[model samples]
Target: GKTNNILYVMSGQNFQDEEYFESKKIFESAGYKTKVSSTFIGTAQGKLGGMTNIDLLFSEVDAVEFDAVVFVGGIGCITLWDDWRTQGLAKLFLDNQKIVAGIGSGVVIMANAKILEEINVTCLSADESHVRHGNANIMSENVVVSGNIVTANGPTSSKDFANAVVGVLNSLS
Candidate 1:
């Protein structure tokens, strides 16, 4: 079997349902196995009345084990924006040179992790300041890719984000 495993990271509350599920579906449809992880082990709620049973806790994830890591976003991601653990995870994936994708405010984790420094990315307009503050080259487009990093502006860009992630994974393989 192909080693197409992905670590899908999400916030514990108010994560965007459309972006999360749609991206997950895209990855799965592309033949990737995805493991859902959150701040803790349990269930996480979405902004639009959806819930996902987290398969792993953030502390339990080892970045090297996955081919790619994706961060799905919404209001709850604000907690992760400055959280050391989430930032550390982002660093781990990038340090290993694996694909890293983020949507909406989830891109905050990448910026705060400092991996976006010098990389070009697109994030939710509200989060543009954080991306700029992180020293990343910000793009106004819905999606942007720099090296192994992929970023999307919001829910509408979810499909593109996932496709970008798959493209990166394929290139790596």
Candidate 2:
């Protein structure tokens, strides 16, 4: 049997639909069991005031239980980007040596958590300020691989980002 797989879905604010589904599909293609987790359960606001809510949970699950954690991106993440729970979860995965991946605004969470410091990373074009604000240096690459951390830019880079994650998974296998 393959190892257990898991991807973290941000429910705190904005979560990118494209990045989320793409990453999920990549990991699932690796033949590992997968699941999505969130810090809180609530409705997410869209650009034109559209709302989409779900039953997200806010429990501090152990990061070691899964082989990897991928964060989806969105603008609502600006507020929750620096949240304690979000930071803790990210730190847990990093410390445990689990594969950590981020895309779009999700890179903001990684940056604020000090995960992007000195690590090659990229996020949505609009999040450049956040990257600078977090004291993280940005890389020119659409996708970056530094040790166990994998990061990519906006939705346009979703394919490359997912491929990068799957590549890492393939290397380990």
Cα error, candidate 1, residue 101 (Å):
1.0
For model 1, residues 32-55, the per-residue Cα lDDT tens digits are 989989978888899998988899
* Candidate 2 colliding pairs: none
Name the lDDT of candidate 2. Answer: 0.73
The residue-level lDDT of candidate 2 at 145 comes to 87
Q: Largest TM-score belongs to which candidate?
A: 1
Taking every candidate in turn, the Cα RMSD to the unseen true structure, in Å, is 1.4, 3.1
lDDT of 2 at 163: 85
Alpha-carbon local distance difference test for all models: 0.88, 0.73
Worst 10 residues of 2 by lDDT: 47-56
